[PDB]
Design a protein around this ligand. Structure first.
Ligand SMILES: O=C(O)c1cc(O)ccc1O
Ligand SMILES: O=C(O)c1cc(O)ccc1O
Length: 129
């Protein structure tokens, strides 16, 4: 599913990401924009052999099982394919674990390089929330 900007903001809010670990909703929308272009089906292979999955591009080396990433820890206890669903529940629950692990949203390269230090509130402006 390719979400609209405000559609995804509303879904993320309903699932508890607004101000989760202190990160306002616009941070999460901005991160999804630049990780996946709001596409739940996005997949991208990493140099190290792992793959990133879903709207928040969650990585198979640590967080989910894709059956082809040697050394994977599957810390979210899910198949990576669960991160590609039109239902964002699995992606959100796994993201909550990731963001809580001490490094915050710096875990997401696109957030660090394209959202952090910007007017992230812009990503939710005009949205019914
Ligand atoms: O909250 C959700 O899971 C949700 C899912 C959608 O497909 C669209 C809007 C939403 O708010
Ligand atoms: O592709 C981009 O860099 C981009 C940046 C924006 O601020 C808005 C939409 C986009 O597609």
């Amino acid at each position: 599913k390719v979400f609209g900007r405000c559609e995804l903001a509303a879904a993320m809010k309903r699932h508890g990401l607004d101000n989760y670990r202190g990160y306002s909703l616009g941070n999460w929308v901005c991160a999804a924009k630049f990780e996946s272009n709001f596409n739940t089906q996005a997949t991208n292979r990493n140099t190290d052999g792992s793959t990133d999955y879903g709207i928040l591009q969650i990585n198979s080396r640590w967080w989910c099982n894709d059956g082809r990433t040697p050394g994977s820890r599957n810390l979210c206890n899910i198949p990576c394919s669960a991160l590609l669903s039109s239902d964002i529940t699995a992606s959100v629950n796994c993201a909550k674990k990731i963001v809580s692990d001490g490094n915050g949203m710096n875990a997401w390269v696109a957030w660090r390089n394209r959202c952090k230090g910007t007017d992230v509130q812009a990503w939710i402006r005009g949205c019914r929330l």
